[PDB]
């Protein structure tokens, strides 16, 4: 049956990014795949079957998928072409997505606030706020 992490099913279509090109630039994206990516206006997907939840995003630039079970860690090649190690838990409500690679590490919250999905990016100092509403 339900799991609390069920708040988080749908399809899912971002409204507002603030400062994103700074987020990508601690990261170590490059120019032009920084002017790509940050144009894009992806749409996510997030389904659950029994342990294993899935995330989809779905856009003109990259569309890419993760399927995991929570507190195992994965493989996952990011949107940017980063080759990771990822592990994705449940802290209290928030889907918490720590990326390993080369000695550096990001995390990505998701969690949500009224009728948004808000993603906080953090690499270091630096956060993004990346804001999606329902499709
Ligand atoms: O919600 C966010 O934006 C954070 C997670 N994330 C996504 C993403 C993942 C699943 C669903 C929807 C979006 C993309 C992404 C996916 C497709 C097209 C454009 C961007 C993304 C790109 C980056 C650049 C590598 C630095 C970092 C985190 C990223």
């Known amino acids: 049956g339900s799991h609390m992490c069920d708040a988080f099913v749908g399809t899912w279509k971002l409204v507002s990014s603030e400062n ?3 987020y990508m630039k601690e990261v170590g994206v490059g120019f032009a795949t920084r002017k790509v990516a940050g144009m894009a206006k992806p749409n996510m997907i997030i389904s659950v079957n029994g342990d294993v939840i899935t995330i989809k ?4 630039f990259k569309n890419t998928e993760i399927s995991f079970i ?3 860690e994965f ?4 949107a940017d072409d980063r080759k990771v190690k990822s592990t994705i838990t449940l802290d209290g409500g928030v889907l918490v997505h720590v990326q390993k690679w080369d000695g550096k590490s ?3 919250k998701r969690k ?3 009728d948004k999905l808000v993603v906080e990016c953090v690499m270091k100092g630096v956060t993004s706020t990346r804001v999606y509403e329902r499709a």
């Open 20 to 22: 994103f090109d700074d």
């Open 106 to 108: 990001t995390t990505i």
């Open 75 to 78: 493989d996952e090649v990011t």
């Open 112 to 114: 949500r606030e009224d």
């Open 57 to 60: 995003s779905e856009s003109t």
């Open 70 to 72: 929570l507190g195992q």
